[PDB]
């Protein structure tokens, strides 16, 4: 049972799904992730995804946290996000207010690739200027609250009521069924899995000979998750512009 | 019974006449185009149940009230579409159902003055839309209601915009095909 | 992923998924397949694209 997703295995298994990174960025990540993880005091830090931009400088986004705790029936991870445009130097991706969350939710299209740009919105005519990093952080928040996939019963609650890896996890009995996976923020033993999601928003392809399942999000096309059952590893990645697929009812 | 003809091709009436005026079954054949009518008459006016073949081959079979299509009837249009239901003042009006031939879709429910205003629109596969449609002002375009798609069995309620963009009130859910 | 699934009932598509995939291929191949500028020379008597033997990369 893994303790943390491995970026090498993620990039190896999800390359068929087109979720790839540049070679220079791959090396740069191999160096930069440990540095930032140590100098931020975090226990976990991984590559969350890669958002494409109009000028060719895609945003790499990394997500880290220290400990996850059960609060109000949800497994809350106090996560912290960082962004980068070369894979070597990570900057903070600061949270956004709730009022601005709606405005950035109204902004669509592929991001510009210039962290200093700000878009404009008009309301009753009061104009707001929303920084691009705000739009980025909210798209990341939406995609994160939508997917955040882990296997079912891979976590467990400890005496201090904290969510820790279940080191005696044996694996998913039926890896080709959506019941084997769940959201990260669902408490262990709560029985809520991906099958409770809106029917038709997930696809699962399972290679029963090699034992590798791929779970693709259809609501957010670009989110891929993999689960290897013979080695008991798993991990996910987002690659794409970050916009939700609203025409899903017409495409199924 | 006088087969009163009208030289100009010219008209050819072949039926019954009660001292000139027409009454009863007859076959009146216009000569300008070829439109024929076989059916009943009253005071010479086409009245009662009577089949008509128009110049463009659009066939009609149903009721007439004083030379105009009225009451229940069935029309076959030149392309292949079919309508069955209530006519009024020579158009679609009241309740009826229209079947397209190309897409094999159908519209069922309340019409108003040749256009579709309320009811259901079903596809060849079972998917459907239900609710308020445009009408004759529009071109029977959907306006406000719910979509059910059969392949995914999904159901979303909403409306359209002036451009035609579908605007959902909420996210889809799993439901059934509007047997109301 | 199945070459004989139904595409859609309305709008009436004339074929199975194989024809829809062939259509997507035909659109993408014309909208996105490119070569570097000046690599070929366009003939005006035809559409045959012969390459100029003098093209500095």
């Amino acid at each position: 049972v893994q303790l943390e997703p491995n970026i090498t295995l993620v990039l190896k298994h999800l390359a068929s799904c087109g979720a790839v990174v540049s070679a220079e960025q791959q090396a740069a990540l191999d160096h930069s992730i440990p540095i930032k993880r140590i100098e931020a005091g975090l226990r976990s830090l991984t590559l969350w995804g890669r958002l494409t931009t109009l000028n060719g400088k895609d945003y790499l986004v990394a997500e880290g946290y220290n400990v996850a705790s059960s609060k109000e029936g949800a497994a809350v991870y106090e996560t912290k996000y960082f962004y980068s445009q070369d894979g070597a130097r990570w900057s903070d991706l600061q949270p956004v207010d709730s009022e601005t969350a709606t405005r950035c939710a109204r902004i669509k299209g592929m991001l510009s690739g210039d962290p200093a740009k700000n878009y404009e919105l008009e309301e009753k005519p009061l104009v707001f200027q929303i920084p691009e990093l705000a739009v980025l952080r909210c798209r990341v928040d939406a995609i994160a609250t939508a997917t955040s996939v882990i296997p079912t019963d891979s976590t467990i609650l400890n005496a201090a009521s904290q969510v820790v890896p279940n080191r005696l996890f044996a694996g998913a009995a039926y890896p080709e069924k959506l019941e084997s996976y769940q959201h990260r923020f669902s408490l262990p033993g709560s029985g809520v899995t991906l099958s409770q999601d809106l029917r038709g928003t997930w696809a699962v392809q399972y290679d029963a000979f090699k034992g590798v399942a791929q779970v693709r999000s259809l609501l957010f096309p670009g989110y891929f998750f993999y689960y290897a059952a013979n080695e008991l590893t798993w991990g996910s990645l987002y690659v794409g512009d970050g916009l939700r697929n609203n025409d899903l009812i017409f495409m199924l | 019974l006088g087969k009163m003809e009208y030289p100009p091709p010219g008209d050819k009436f072949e039926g019954t006449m009660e001292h000139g005026v027409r009454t009863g079954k007859g076959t009146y054949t216009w000569g300008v185009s070829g439109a024929v009518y076989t059916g009943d008459y009253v005071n010479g006016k086409k009245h009662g149940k009577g089949k008509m073949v128009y110049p463009d081959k659009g066939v009609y079979e149903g009721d007439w009230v004083e030379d105009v299509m009225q009451g229940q009837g069935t029309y076959t249009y030149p392309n292949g579409d079919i309508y069955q239901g209530a006519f009024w003042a020579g158009k679609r009006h009241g309740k009826g159902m229209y079947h397209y031939k190309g897409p094999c879709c159908q519209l069922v429910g309340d019409w108003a003055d040749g256009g579709f205003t309320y009811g259901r629109w079903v596809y060849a596969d079972g998917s459907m839309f239900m609710g308020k449609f445009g009408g004759a002002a529009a071109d029977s375009k959907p306006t406000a209601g719910s979509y059910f798609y059969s392949s995914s069995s999904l159901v979303q309620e909403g409306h359209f915009a002036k451009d035609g963009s579908w605007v959902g009130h909420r996210d889809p859910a799993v439901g059934k095909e509007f047997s109301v | 992923g199945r070459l004989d699934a139904p595409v859609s009932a309305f709008p009436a598509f004339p074929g199975n998924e194989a024809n829809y995939l062939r259509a997507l291929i035909a659109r993408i191949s014309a909208a996105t397949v490119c070569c570097p500028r000046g690599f070929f020379t366009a003939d005006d008597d035809s559409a045959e694209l012969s390459a100029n033997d003098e093209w500095v990369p």
């Binding site: 087109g18 669509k108 096309p221 025409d247 017409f250 495409m251 | 128009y54 110049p55 463009d56 659009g58 029309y75 249009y77 030149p78 392309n79 579409d81 020579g90 158009k91 679609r92 229209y98 397209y100 190309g102 897409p103 879709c105 519209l107 040749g114 256009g115 579709f116 629109w121 071109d139 029977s140 375009k141 959907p142 451009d163 035609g164 963009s165 579908w166 | 309305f10 709008p11 995939l21 997507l24 659109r27 993408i28 996105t32």
Partner: peptide, 27 residues
């Protein structure tokens, strides 16, 4: 080279409306 879902982007797609019901002969 192409690698993707085959979905054109641009936001210029919306559901198709029914074909116009044929009008009668005498217009």
């Amino acid at each position: 080279m192409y690698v993707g879902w085959g979905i054109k982007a641009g936001g210029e797609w919306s559901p198709c409306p029914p074909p116009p019901p044929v009008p009668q002969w005498g217009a």
